[PDB]
Amino acid sequence: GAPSFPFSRASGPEPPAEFAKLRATNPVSQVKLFDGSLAWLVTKHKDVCFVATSEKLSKVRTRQGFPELSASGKQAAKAKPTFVDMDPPEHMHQRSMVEPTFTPEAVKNLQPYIQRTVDDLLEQMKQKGCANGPVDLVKEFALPVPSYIIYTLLGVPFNDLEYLTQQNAIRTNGSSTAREASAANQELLDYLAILVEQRLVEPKDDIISKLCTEQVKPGNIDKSDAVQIAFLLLVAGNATMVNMIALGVATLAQHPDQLAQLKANPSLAPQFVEELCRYHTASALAIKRTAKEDVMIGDKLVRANEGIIASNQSANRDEEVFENPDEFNMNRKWPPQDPLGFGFGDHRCIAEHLAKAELTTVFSTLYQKFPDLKVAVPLGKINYTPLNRDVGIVDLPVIF
Numbered sequence: 001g002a003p004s005f006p007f008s009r010a011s012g013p014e015p016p017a018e019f020a021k022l023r024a025t026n027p028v029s030q031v032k033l034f035d036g037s038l039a040w041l042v043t044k045h046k047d048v049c050f051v052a053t054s055e056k057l058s059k060v061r062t063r064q065g066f067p068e069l070s071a072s073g074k075q076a077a078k079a080k081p082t083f084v085d086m087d088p089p090e091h092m093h094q095r096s097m098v099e100p101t102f103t104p105e106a107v108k109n110l111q112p113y114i115q116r117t118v119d120d121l122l123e124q125m126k127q128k129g130c131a132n133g134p135v136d137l138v139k140e141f142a143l144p145v146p147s148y149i150i151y152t153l154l155g156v157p158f159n160d161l162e163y164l165t166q167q168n169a170i171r172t173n174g175s176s177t178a179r180e181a182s183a184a185n186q187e188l189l190d191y192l193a194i195l196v197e198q199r200l201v202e203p204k205d206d207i208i209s210k211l212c213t214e215q216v217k218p219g220n221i222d223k224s225d226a227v228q229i230a231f232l233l234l235v236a237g238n239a240t241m242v243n244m245i246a247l248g249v250a251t252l253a254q255h256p257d258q259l260a261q262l263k264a265n266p267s268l269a270p271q272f273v274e275e276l277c278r279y280h281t282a283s284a285l286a287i288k289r290t291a292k293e294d295v296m297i298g299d300k301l302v303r304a305n306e307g308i309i310a311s312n313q314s315a316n317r318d319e320e321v322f323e324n325p326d327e328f329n330m331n332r333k334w335p336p337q338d339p340l341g342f343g344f345g346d347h348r349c350i351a352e353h354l355a356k357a358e359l360t361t362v363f364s365t366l367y368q369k370f371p372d373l374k375v376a377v378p379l380g381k382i383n384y385t386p387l388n389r390d391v392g393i394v395d396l397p398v399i400f
């Protein structure tokens with residue numbers, strides 16, 4: 001019978017062991033989901049790209065056979081969809097309403113702001129110090145960097161960032177009760193609704209204001225849609241950003257020669273970030289589809305109304321594309337094929353340029369500020385996310 005999926009990571013920082021075996025012997029295979037239903041799992045880079053781009057496959061979650069991976073996903077599929085779950089032409093109709101803030105040119109213009117935000121959080125961390133024991137790099141740094149940036153871009157005023165950063169963290173923290181997580185979720189939605197009302201009356205230079213002026217007031221979307229689009233932009237990427245920063249620090253601690261290179265030359269941060277986003281694919285469960293019609297993938301027939309999950313994590317370890325794929329090597333020579341940390345095709349992460357700018361700013365600055373930054377617990381004792389989840393780090397004690 002088909003194995004249960006998601007698979008568990010082989011260890012804290014490693015992908016599931018199953019993918020390498022499937023790439024070698026059964027690259028398109030069936031897996032069993034939490035409800036006992038089946039889905040196709042695609043593991044090779046070429047095939048993941050095919051799934052990501054085929055117009056015979058749909059992201060619409062009300063379609064029969066959609067591969068929801070948990071009961072919570074089934075419940076979330078009942079809500080009015082935003083662009084993450086749309087096909088053409090609806091997908092770009094809505095995504096284009098917010099894409100302008102995320103273009104390469106817009107992100108380049110944001111660089112001084114990104115640098116200031118990182119610098120200010122690093123200075124707060126220095127002022128707080130570590131004179132009485134280690135501090136949690138996640139709480140002090142990896143969490144607020146992406147949080148402050150996305151909230152600011154959306155339109156949150158500076159005074160409200162610390163509290164809203166804490167509340168959004170509660171929503172996904174593994175220690176929160178269901179009541180606590182639900183209350184934090186609703187608190188964020190209530191806050192965003194008030195902010196939308198404010199920007200309908202007096203727009204400012206932020207994403208919510210642009211939605212209000214350009215889409216809500218003309219009747220292209222309503223104010224509840226603006227809230228849901230803003231909420232999507234907050235929650236889609238934030239936990240992934242936090243995990244990528246923490247994973248980068250841990251990966252450098254595990255690879256001290258490459259850390260020494262980066263300390264001696266901060267201009268290596270872009271290459272470090274490229275290798276990090278390939279090696280630690282912290283969002284590996286988002287390339288999902290159902291077949292609108294029969295489609296052949298390799299030696300398998302995916303029938304109409306069957307689900308498909310395309311593992312970009314597996315694709316990023318595909319030996320046929322990336323030589324020595326299971327070694328972290330920021331000095332590698334890159335092949336012609338894209339790494340897939342941010343997905344592929346029409347739905348490729350809207351924030352890829354912003355996320356890479358945040359990560360590059362972090363890794364070109366962190367060890368200039370704190371040349372003696374050290375993970376304070378043994379590396380084998382790092383508190384990674386549970387093995388049945390996307391790779392990440394919950395907390396990371398450090399000294400400096």
Ligand code: HEM
Binds near residue numbers: 150312348
């Ligand atoms: C290192 C950090 C991040 C990683 C690795 C990442 C990864 C991904 C991946 C794998 C997807 C699926 C793309 C696909 O369907 O092919 C995606 C989509 C998306 N991401 Fe990110 N993401 C990151 C940060 C962010 C941030 C900071 C934001 C928002 C500010 C964000 C917003 C979104 C949205 C809205 C989508 C859906 C795009 C669509 O379906 O059109 N992501 N991301």
